[PDB]
Write a structure and sequence with these properties.
1 chains, about 700 residues, alpha/beta, 7-stranded mixed beta sheet, 26 helices, globular, ATP-binding
Amino acid sequence: GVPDFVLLNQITENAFIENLTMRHKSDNIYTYIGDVVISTNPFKNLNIYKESDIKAYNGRYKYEMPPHMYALANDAYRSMRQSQENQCVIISGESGAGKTEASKKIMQFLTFVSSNQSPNGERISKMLLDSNPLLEAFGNAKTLRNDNSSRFGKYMEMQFNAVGSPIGGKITNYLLEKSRVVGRTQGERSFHIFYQMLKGLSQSKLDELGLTPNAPAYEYLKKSGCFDVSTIDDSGEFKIIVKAMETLGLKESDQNSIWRILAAILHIGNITFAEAAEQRTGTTTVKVSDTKSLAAAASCLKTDQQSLSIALCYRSISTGVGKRCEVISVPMDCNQAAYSRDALAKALYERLFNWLVSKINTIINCTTEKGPVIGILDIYGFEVFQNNSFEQLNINFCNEKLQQLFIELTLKSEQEEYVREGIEWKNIEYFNNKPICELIEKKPIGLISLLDEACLIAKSTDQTFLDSICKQFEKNPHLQSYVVSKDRSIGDTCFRLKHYAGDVTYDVRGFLDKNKDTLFGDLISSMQSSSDPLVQGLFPPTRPEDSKKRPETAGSQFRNAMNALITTLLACSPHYVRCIKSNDNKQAGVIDEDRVRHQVRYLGLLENVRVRRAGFAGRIEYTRFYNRYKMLCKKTWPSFNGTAKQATELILQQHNIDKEEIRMGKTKVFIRNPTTLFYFEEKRELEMP
């Protein structure tokens, strides 16, 4: 009748949408693109992931029941069950499209299949449901496009035993946005952990720390631009979070210990540099008139206020293996002072978040069991604001790397599996491997390769670097501007950049100082040699499972963090799930035609289907082509060989048909035009009434 989506009456553009709409309005959410799942997000609890439906899809196949358990899984996730290995699922899409729901679908499908009962196994099924009111507190922030937007890459890992049942899991984060601690547009926030504190502690405790329930009063928080949000109610959320804080195991005693770390950051935030007017003209020294605020930090940091001012304002260098003799120095400009200042407040939080979340699991993470691991991916999605900037460049860059991930896996890796599983396969035309957009920013002579060159040249400002792009390139594909491309739409202070489809114009504000975030010893060394257990805690015993070389900026370190991510993604058994946002009105049962159509277009997912199989009109699976058109040919009866694709050859070679007319491969038979599907039926119709 209507076996899944592959089988359409008309394999065309218009028919593809008409059916897609007919699917959505027929309680058919999940749609198959080619052994790959495409889903959406209801943004709430739907009664379709509960026992009943789970028991429906057990021991059956795809072509037997409606879209829900794409055969590939049953034929791949189970294929490695005899081989005896673990899996890993990757998920992508727009922000808010359920870097969670799509992950939950895996769980609710994963359980039960693992033979149900298990005291330690079903326990996580209960706690992970109580994670929804919890997870939204730590690694989440509000974007103008998404409220529950995670602000850090996450690769969850489900642990199991030598049977198939779950036992526990761990978490791994990444470099994460840099300038979201000090710079942002009026309306957005930085991180919850800060705001949740201010409207939590009693005014009494705040006054003791020289604080006040009002961000505007501060400086660091004032440089952000905004403070209050119209959609979020922090004051009323605190007491609700406290219950969630205790749910894990963070008693008031522990809470107070955590607030000190933030208080330390706030004390750093009340420390600026009253541009010392010691020098009379050009260069300038650094002096602190507001000693009250400066002293407050050193007081809570429990370090010598004097040494702190001398060691930081004046950098030390003289490490001749024997290991250093400090103090020799001389003042420097204000820009560098404010720059080095930020680098301290940026590196402190990075190593904080890492050590913080890792110490939370100490109470949560299962220690009772031990075993392998199955991975799950979740990252921030695509976005476009009124005005783009350096931030969008790095984010959109990740999408290009993400698009490459799929291509490398669902398009390239799978092809190599055909020639490895003893199948007569031939290299079918596939759109460019687009390795040029990658080599243009990795090996010598490249984007971020030239950028690294422009960074360390302290004088080469953002403007000068932008000039190095237009000249070195504007010849290689995927780049334009106002000089080469005659188009007024490109401002003189802006530049055009072509993506995989859409066009985006960026600004060059920040770039360097924002990306660098370099902090050498001299400044760090003063903190590492602290006696307080908290301060030194922010500086773990030297490189935890991340050594290599140490000094080389944090910007270049970002690339390394993302490269180390893909390296471990291309060494396992992938699984593909993509998400799409319903609408911008939070409506139920309403599809935005233009919005959804656009997403499917600029991503080239329909061209993907074509290339995935080979590319043309109507296409049908071999495994399925066989058990369907048998009565047409002779000797294609229970006295068969077994193979499906081989039989197809025997049928077409005996009746003398040009073999180039039909393209042969592993899966998906290729016969041009859909008019032939009738030709098969007719060949069967008027020969046996």
